[PDB]
Each structure stands twice: as C-alpha cells, then as structure tokens.
Amino acid sequence: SGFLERMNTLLANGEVPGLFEGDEYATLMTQCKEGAQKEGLMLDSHEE
Amino acid sequence: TDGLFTHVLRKIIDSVRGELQKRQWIVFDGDVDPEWVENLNSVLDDNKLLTLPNGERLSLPPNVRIMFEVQDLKYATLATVSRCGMVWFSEDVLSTD
Amino acid sequence: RDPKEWIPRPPEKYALSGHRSPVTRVIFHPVFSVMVSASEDATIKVWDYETGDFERTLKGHTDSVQDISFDHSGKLLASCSADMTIKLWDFQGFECIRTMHGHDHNVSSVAIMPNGDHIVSASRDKTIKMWEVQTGYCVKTFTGHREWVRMVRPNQDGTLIASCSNDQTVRVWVVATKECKAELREHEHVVECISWAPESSYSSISEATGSETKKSGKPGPFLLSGSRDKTIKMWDVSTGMCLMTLVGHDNWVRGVLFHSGGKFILSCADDKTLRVWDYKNKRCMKTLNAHEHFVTSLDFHKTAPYVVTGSVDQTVKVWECR
Amino acid sequence: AQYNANHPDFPMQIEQLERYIQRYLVYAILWSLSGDSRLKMRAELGEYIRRITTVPLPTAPNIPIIDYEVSISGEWSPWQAKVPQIEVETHKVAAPDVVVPTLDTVRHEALLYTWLAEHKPLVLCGPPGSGKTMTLFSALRALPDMEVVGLNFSSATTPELLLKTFDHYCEYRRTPNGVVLAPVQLGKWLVLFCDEINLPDMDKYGTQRVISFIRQMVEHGGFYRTSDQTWVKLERIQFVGACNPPTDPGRKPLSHRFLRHVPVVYVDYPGPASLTQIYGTFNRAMLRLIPSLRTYAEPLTAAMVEFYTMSQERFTQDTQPHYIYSPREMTRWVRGIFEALRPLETLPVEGLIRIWAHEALRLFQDRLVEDEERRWTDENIDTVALKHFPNIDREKAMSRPILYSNWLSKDYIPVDQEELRDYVKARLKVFYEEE
Amino acid sequence: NSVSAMKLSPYYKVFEEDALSWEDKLNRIMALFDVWIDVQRRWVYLEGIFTGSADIKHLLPVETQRFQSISTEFLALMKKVSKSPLVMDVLNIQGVQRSLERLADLLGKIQKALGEYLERERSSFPRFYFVGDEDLLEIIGNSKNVAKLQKHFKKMFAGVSSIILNEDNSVVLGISSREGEEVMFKTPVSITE
Numbered sequence A: 001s002g003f004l005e006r007m008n009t010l011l012a013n014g015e016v017p018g019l020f021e022g023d024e025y026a027t028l029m030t031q032c033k034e035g036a037q038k039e040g041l042m043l044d045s046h047e048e
Numbered sequence B: 001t002d003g004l005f006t007h008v009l010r011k012i013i014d015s016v017r018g019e020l021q022k023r024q025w026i027v028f029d030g031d032v033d034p035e036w037v038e039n040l041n042s043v044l045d046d047n048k049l050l051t052l053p054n055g056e057r058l059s060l061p062p063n064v065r066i067m068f069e070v071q072d073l074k075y076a077t078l079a080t081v082s083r084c085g086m087v088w089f090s091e092d093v094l095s096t097d
Numbered sequence C: 001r002d003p004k005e006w007i008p009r010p011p012e013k014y015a016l017s018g019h020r021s022p023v024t025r026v027i028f029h030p031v032f033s034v035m036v037s038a039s040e041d042a043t044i045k046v047w048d049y050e051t052g053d054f055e056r057t058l059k060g061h062t063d064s065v066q067d068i069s070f071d072h073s074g075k076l077l078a079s080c081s082a083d084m085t086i087k088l089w090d091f092q093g094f095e096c097i098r099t100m101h102g103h104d105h106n107v108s109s110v111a112i113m114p115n116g117d118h119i120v121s122a123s124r125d126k127t128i129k130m131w132e133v134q135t136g137y138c139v140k141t142f143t144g145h146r147e148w149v150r151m152v153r154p155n156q157d158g159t160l161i162a163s164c165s166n167d168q169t170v171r172v173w174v175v176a177t178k179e180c181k182a183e184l185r186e187h188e189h190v191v192e193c194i195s196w197a198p199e200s201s202y203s204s205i206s207e208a209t210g211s212e213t214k215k216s217g218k219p220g221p222f223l224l225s226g227s228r229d230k231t232i233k234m235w236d237v238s239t240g241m242c243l244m245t246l247v248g249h250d251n252w253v254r255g256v257l258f259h260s261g262g263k264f265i266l267s268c269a270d271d272k273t274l275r276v277w278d279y280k281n282k283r284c285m286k287t288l289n290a291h292e293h294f295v296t297s298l299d300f301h302k303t304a305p306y307v308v309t310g311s312v313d314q315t316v317k318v319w320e321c322r
Numbered sequence D: 001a002q003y004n005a006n007h008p009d010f011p012m013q014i015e016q017l018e019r020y021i022q023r024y025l026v027y028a029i030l031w032s033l034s035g036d037s038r039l040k041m042r043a044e045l046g047e048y049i050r051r052i053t054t055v056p057l058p059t060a061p062n063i064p065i066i067d068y069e070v071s072i073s074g075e076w077s078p079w080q081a082k083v084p085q086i087e088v089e090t091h092k093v094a095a096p097d098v099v100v101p102t103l104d105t106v107r108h109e110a111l112l113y114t115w116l117a118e119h120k121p122l123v124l125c126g127p128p129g130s131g132k133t134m135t136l137f138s139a140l141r142a143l144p145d146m147e148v149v150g151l152n153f154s155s156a157t158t159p160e161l162l163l164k165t166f167d168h169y170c171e172y173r174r175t176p177n178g179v180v181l182a183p184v185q186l187g188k189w190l191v192l193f194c195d196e197i198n199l200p201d202m203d204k205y206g207t208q209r210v211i212s213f214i215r216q217m218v219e220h221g222g223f224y225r226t227s228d229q230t231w232v233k234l235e236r237i238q239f240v241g242a243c244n245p246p247t248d249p250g251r252k253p254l255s256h257r258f259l260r261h262v263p264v265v266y267v268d269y270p271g272p273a274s275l276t277q278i279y280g281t282f283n284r285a286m287l288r289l290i291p292s293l294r295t296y297a298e299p300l301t302a303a304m305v306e307f308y309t310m311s312q313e314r315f316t317q318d319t320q321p322h323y324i325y326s327p328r329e330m331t332r333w334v335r336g337i338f339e340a341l342r343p344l345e346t347l348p349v350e351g352l353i354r355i356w357a358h359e360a361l362r363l364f365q366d367r368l369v370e371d372e373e374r375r376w377t378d379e380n381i382d383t384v385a386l387k388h389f390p391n392i393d394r395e396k397a398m399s400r401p402i403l404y405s406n407w408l409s410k411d412y413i414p415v416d417q418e419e420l421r422d423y424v425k426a427r428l429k430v431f432y433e434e435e
Numbered sequence E: 001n002s003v004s005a006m007k008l009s010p011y012y013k014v015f016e017e018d019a020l021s022w023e024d025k026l027n028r029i030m031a032l033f034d035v036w037i038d039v040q041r042r043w044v045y046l047e048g049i050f051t052g053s054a055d056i057k058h059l060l061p062v063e064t065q066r067f068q069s070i071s072t073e074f075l076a077l078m079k080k081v082s083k084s085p086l087v088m089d090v091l092n093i094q095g096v097q098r099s100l101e102r103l104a105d106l107l108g109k110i111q112k113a114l115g116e117y118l119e120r121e122r123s124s125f126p127r128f129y130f131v132g133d134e135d136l137l138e139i140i141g142n143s144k145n146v147a148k149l150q151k152h153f154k155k156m157f158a159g160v161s162s163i164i165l166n167e168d169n170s171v172v173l174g175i176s177s178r179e180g181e182e183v184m185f186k187t188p189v190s191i192t193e
C-alpha cells in the first residue's frame, strides 16, 4: 500500500515531500542548481 | 594560477589593505638549489622584477625585502650568491650559555 | 536558370527504381556526373542522373546500409551498414578495399573528413569513432552522447564535427582535442538530420537573422538540425544560440541542407514532401509531393541544377531545377 | 477597526456601528447555521430568521437573505453587485487559475476569507469537482500572508505524512518554553490543504488516527515528537480540509470532537444557470479566435451543458465507481476545443461541431464499460448536436469515425482512418527496429 | 588591541560578557567587510566591461545575462544599504554574509569567464600583452576613473610611471617618471574626444 501512497502523492502534487532526506536532499539541491543554471534560471535558496 | 610567492608578492603590490605602507619581509626558510632560486635572478638583480611565463612582470616595491635563511650553500650557483647580501652566522654566535 | 537561384520543380526527370528495400541515403559524385544511393537490402546502387540509367550495384554489406559518403576527390566511397561494419570502396575499380569493425552496435552514420585521410562514424552505442583511411585503425572515440547517435557531419575545414542523437541534443565537438565545444538543445523530440552552412551563405544568414557584423569578420559556423518535432532549427555554433526555427513540415524532418549558393534551405520530411525554404523571411516558399511514401534523404548538386531524393518507396527521384 | 484606520478623520459612529453589528449578526448566524447544508435549507433558515427577528432585513419579496452581504456602511447590499460579466482573455480560456465570478463563488470567497483571516481551521464539503480547491485558492489569493501546501489523504494515510510535510516546510526550534515547530520562512502563515480528510481508514473501534492527530494539533496547539516524547507547540500553522460528503462510498463520517473546532461549508455543484454563465463566458472568450463563429457561442455552451446534464443523470456511482461527472469535465471540454481552435485561421460551423463531438466522445465515452452505454452516448451526442445546431450538414459534422490527430499534420485536425492506418503501419515498422 | 589589553588586565573578570560581545561584533564586521571590499571592486570593474562594450552581448550572451542578474541583485543590496547606511543595520541585515559570499563567488566565475574577451582585446593595444588578466580587467573597466590607472603605467612603458592630467581629468597633459621627471605633450590628448 505504501507504493500506492507514494503514487497518490506524486500524481496529485508532482512531488513527494518525504522522498528526499538527508544527503539525498543536498544532492538533489545540487542537481537542481546546475539544472536551473543549465536551463537559464538563477535560483539560490532551497525553496525556489 | 598564482603560486605562493607570486600570490604574496601580488597581494603586497596591490596593497588593497595598505600593504605598501608596511615593512613586508619575505623569508625563504629552507634549502637553496638553482631549480627554484634561479627564477629570482631578476628579482634579486637591479631589475627588481619577477617575470612569469604568461608575460606578466611584477615590480618589487621598495619596502619589500627578500630574505633567505639557509644552513649551507653547497648547491647554490654563483649567480644566486653574487646577487644577495651575505650574512654569516657561525655556530659560535649562539653559545650554550 | 540563374546560376545560384534554381529550385526543384514538380515535373521529375527520372524515377530510378532498382532497390528491393527502402532507399536510405542518396549522394552525388563530386566530380563525375554520376550518383550513388544505398538501400536497406545491403546494396549500394550507382545511377547516371543525366540519362537516368542504372550502372552497377556495390555489395558486400551483410545488413541494411545506413550511410554513404564521398571524399573530396571522389575516388573513395565510405559506407556504413547495420552489420556493425564500415567499408571503404575504391570507386575506380568498385572493390571494397578495407572493412572496419569496432562499433558495438548499429552504425547509423559515416563521413569522410575534408582532408580525406580520416573517416568519422557514429553508432548506436552512443559513440563517435575516427578511423584512419590508410590503415583502418580506430584512433579517437568521442563519447558524451547519452543515446543513439544518428548522424555526424564535419564542417568545411574539418576542425569541428556535429552529432545529433536520440538524447534530444546536438553536440559540436573539436576534432583536435576531443572536447565538446557546444551542446545545442531546443528540439522537443529526437533530432534526425544536421547540416553545416556553406561559406557563401554566412553573409546572407548574417543579414537574415539581423546579426551584427563581428569585428573578427567571421560570422561563426552555422548549423542546422531537422527533428521529429517537425521543426528545422538553425543555430550559431560560436554562441550556441538558435538563430531561427523553421516550421511547416507535417512530420519528422529526415534531411536538410543549404542551396549550394546559400540562398535557400532544402529539406525533406516523412510528410511525403520536399520543401524549399526562404530563410530570408523565415517562411517556406515551395512544397513538392516528392514521393508516394516517406522521404528519407536528399542531396543537392554543387554545380549542376539537380536534386536527388530517396524514399521508403524504394524509388530514387531526380529533379531538374528551373 | 479597518474602517476606522481608513477614516482617521471620521471614526466609526455608534448608531452606524449598531446597524452594522445587527446586520452582520444576522448574516453570521445564517452563514454559520446553514453554511453546511443545501440551498433550500439556507432559504428555510433565512425565512425562519425573517419570521422571528427584529433586525432590519432586505425587502426583496423572493430573494433570500443569504444573497445579501452587510456593507461597512451598515446596510444590506445584494451579492450580485460583486458579480460582473467579465471578458476573459482568449489565451486564459479555462486556465486553472481563472475563476469566473459567480454568486456562490463570491459568497464562499467572503466566508472563506473571514474564517481564514482568524487562522481558524475549516472544512469544505461537497461533490468531487464542485470547486472547493478553486474556491480555497481564490480565497488565499486575497491573503498574501499564507502559502497553501497540498496534502492528499488516502485510506492508508497516517500522521507520518503530516510529519514529512512539517519536516520539509518547517523546523523544530528550541525555546525556553519548549520546542516550537515553525515554518522555515518568516512572517508568513503555512496552511495545510488536506484534500481527502475523511478517506483515512477507521479502525474497528471507530477512530481515525490522523483525524485524532489533527484534532490534537488544533485544540491543544501541538503534538508529541515521539522520538524523544517531547511536547511540540505549533506556530504560524493552519489547517484546511476538503472532503466529499460522508455518505459517499469509501468516506467515513468525522468525529464530533474533531468537528467542534472546524466549521464546515457546503459547496454544491453549480446549477444550470451558473454553469451556463461560466462556460458561456469561457466560450465567448474562446470563439474570438474565429470571428465567423462568434454567433455560435450561446448554442454551443447550452449544448455542452445539456449533454453534460444528461450524462450526470444517466451514469452514476451506482453502476460503476468511476462514473463521476463534474464541472472538471466541462473545463476539459473548453480546454480541448480551444486547443483544437488555436492554430486554425478559419473554420466552418460543421468543423466546430465535429470538434465538439470529438471532445464529448473523449470525455464521456472513454470511461464507459459496456457497449450499450457507448451507443447511448453516441446517439445522444447526435441528438443534442442536431437540436442546438439545426441547418448544418449532419453527415459532414457527425461522420461516425471521428478521429483527430496531429501525426499527419502540424496541427490538430481530423484524420482519415485509412491514412492513419497506413501511417501507423509505417511508424510501427520503424518502431520495431528502434525500440 | 584595546579590548585585548583589557582582557589581559586583572579587572576584566567583571567585564567578561560585554568584552566578548564586542569581540564578536568587531570580528563579524571584519569578516563581512573584508570580502565586501573585494566584491565592490570586482563589481566596479565588471560593470565597466559589461556596459562599455557593445560586442560583449553578442559574443558572450549567456555570461552577459548572468552579469545583469548578479548586478541587479547587487544594486538591490546596495539600495538596502543606502536606506539604512549605519554600520550595524547593514551588519544586522538578514543573510548579508551569505549574500556577499555568493556575490564574491559569482563575480569570480564571471571574471574567469572573460578570458577570451580580454585576450582578443589585447590586440587593440599591444602593450596590454604585458598586463595580467586581473589588471587588464581593472584597466578596461575603470577607464572612466583615470585616477586609479596611475599604478599600471609602469608595466606598459619603459619609464612612464604616471601620466599628467588636467583638473577635469579629461585631457592628458603629459607623463611622469618614477623619479618625478615629467614630459609635457606639445599637443595634449583629449580623453573625451
């Protein structure tokens, strides 16, 4: 059932709040950094 | 990319924080062999210039003294010795008392 | 027939048809008045486009032949096929003088450098390889594409190679130092075909896009890319910017190239049409119902006013330009 | 207080304050005691109040009191004064943000703003797709000092979902009075929009764990961090829930002890008049792309509404669980027609009717299970199109193999079956070798 | 130094908390301003490059846009400084230190992204070949403020240590050497022209 819970959250919001934690969150922030720069936007703080 | 001595000398020359108004001494404490010291031939000469391969040339400020603290000169060439002021500290200078 | 302005016309000259399988690519001989066309039946048939008669078939490939190319002199013919091999044909005697292996999967493109001493190929293992013409040795391996590389095309002076791939991007590489000079991504689908810009077009492009004259005097190499999102984008390699997007094709763009005089853009697509684009005004002038099925490739002769187009209908068509 | 701030020279006067307070008291009694019931029950409560009260009331013979707001001047004003017939931009036709003003929309907007401004938790109850999320977001646009964070409850939802949301969007800081959980950003209120609060399963002892957890955060203003058994006090956090009526399948009635803290507002499906107004506005905005078609805005919208109504009464959750029809399907209808109309420079009326029919088929027939219902849908689409659009080429607009594709052209245009078959065969031939 | 001398004094035990408080204040002031001065100088000679050159937009479009974004953020921060130009308010500005560090990093990246432009610009004036990239950027960006260019002339000419300028600093009246010897131009050169 947890599979369906994660799918529910992902389909409804496009993101799982509890999926990235700890080092995963920092790594994801990294790839989002070069993704935004490498697309053309500047986003420094984590929330944007 | 600047090296240690190049970085120090460039920071002194730029004098962002009033370095030129000070007495800057750069003391090379260690062994002397031509490989690293011959690059200072223009610095210790009347040119007073450090020349980098990138074409940049750094002039020695009048308030900067280049000091070497060495225990021997069995490998230094005549070019380095002739370019510097010699001060000889015999072992008898510092007595056991 | 303005010597730099002819465009193809709906009345076809010949409809050459000897292939038993979809015709993949068609190229013109740089010197002789002869034309070459490879198909998926592992055959490379050679036709004379002045009188429209079959001459001879080059065989030896095991699987479908995907790309064929000539050198500057027109004496050697590099071909690659789906059987993971690249063959070099002595075009005077019509024998395969050398066969090259090394690609791990399907080889979907091949091109001879302008100097004529190296062959650059792109394969489904996401790699580009460089081979010596004399020895047939693999000497360089461009990696960095994340998907199947479809074509590779060097520029005029042979210092850069452009590669399109299923990874949505076109990568411009420096041959000397193997680095990735540029990575151009604006296509929303797979890029099929690319083409470089002839010198005689630079100035035109410079005033077509309104780009100001650089103080260097070189406007910068310009690249084109047709893609499966039914768009043909022309880029400035030097700045990495998409100078323009050309829209109007009804399906995947399979081939794209400049008019030899650098005033028009010739393209073909799976919408069964060959389109002539006035990139001065960023609009398509002419549309030809070239074939009765998908159009796969086209070539535009350097001097003579002829356009050769291959298609999946196993038919290669010659078009006089008036 | 806001009025007095706006009028420093002329503070609020006692007689006008008394009038305002009386009218607002009647208004608040009405919107508190019947905000969670149908329109008929609101009218009944209004009639009872009119029959028993002494406060001055609107003199409209038939318009119920619930249609009147209390102006700051201290007099009743009809809500219709705040519902103008707007003209939406053609590029914002049926966009998710766009809300067409309506009597119900503005009333619920005002009530939601009134409750949210107090940071009081609330629940929006109504049929799925009625407009609860839209209404809440419209209310939150008028309050710049809140973010909404969306949580979607399910039958297996338990408090750890709220815990992860708090972990992401808030932090636990140590203060001398204890541990305080506060949003990472400052000055600005977090509002947790829990979309399915009454879906979480109820154990065999009549309790939903997440409902108890939310009740504990709401009443006691905090919870217990179970890692160290530490009481944590919430700061600058608000809860807003949405849910289908508890009588719907799979939904459980909420606990009364939880309900005493959360006022409930009932947002019903818009009536045929409201649907007509909203989607007539949308269609008028859309049809400006092709001027020659502008005169067909009023039938088409009506036609749409008519068909929608029949579907909503013909297919219900009694037959199949997914036979749910809402204004969301009409929003998708308008979006699809607009997308089909954008690249076309001109189009005869028969083509517009064909696009309408194709969108109706894709929205109302794809989910049908057995063949008879699909036959019913086809026949009734034909009948509705003929009824609202007479004197059109019946065959040219309702040629039965209705297929639309952009595979054979740059735009979304009707496609012949045989051409599409041949093209798909060729694409499959390529697909075999590539994939 | 004075507060440290207080620390070594025997009477400092009753003044622990406030002495350490001013240690913290002064140390944070230095930490902020040491990077802040460098950020200011780098922006000063970067805006000159990105405004005085018309071809930099075409040849370096992406880094151009990077610099306008960074420059708008810097101007916003400077406006916030100007509204409350007391030292503690700017010291107490939320996230001033991290913002300054980010600005320093971004300015450094932009500076290292200008190598080709400076190398090509060296062709116009050949003596630029004997000037480093940092000093060349300082020279080109600060062309308007000729007062700070007097320290670079010794690297470009045999004995022209400094130049002589009028009161307006717009017409070059002559040159000077290290020893003070001066040469007065017969026809002074107008910078404005």
Ligand SMILES: Nc1ncnc2c1ncn2[C@@H]1O[C@H](COP(=O)(O)OP(=O)(O)O)[C@@H](O)[C@H]1O
Binding pocket: D094, D098, D099, D100, D101, D102, D105, D127, D128, D129, D130, D131, D132, D133, D134, D135, D242, D270, D278, D327, D328, D331
């Ligand atoms: N007055 C209105 N103006 C604009 N759109 C409306 C209006 N009333 C209903 N809608 C449509 O109804 C849908 C509302 O569904 P939603 O708010 O998501 O329901 P729920 O909150 O139950 O999920 C929206 O897609 C919207 O397009």
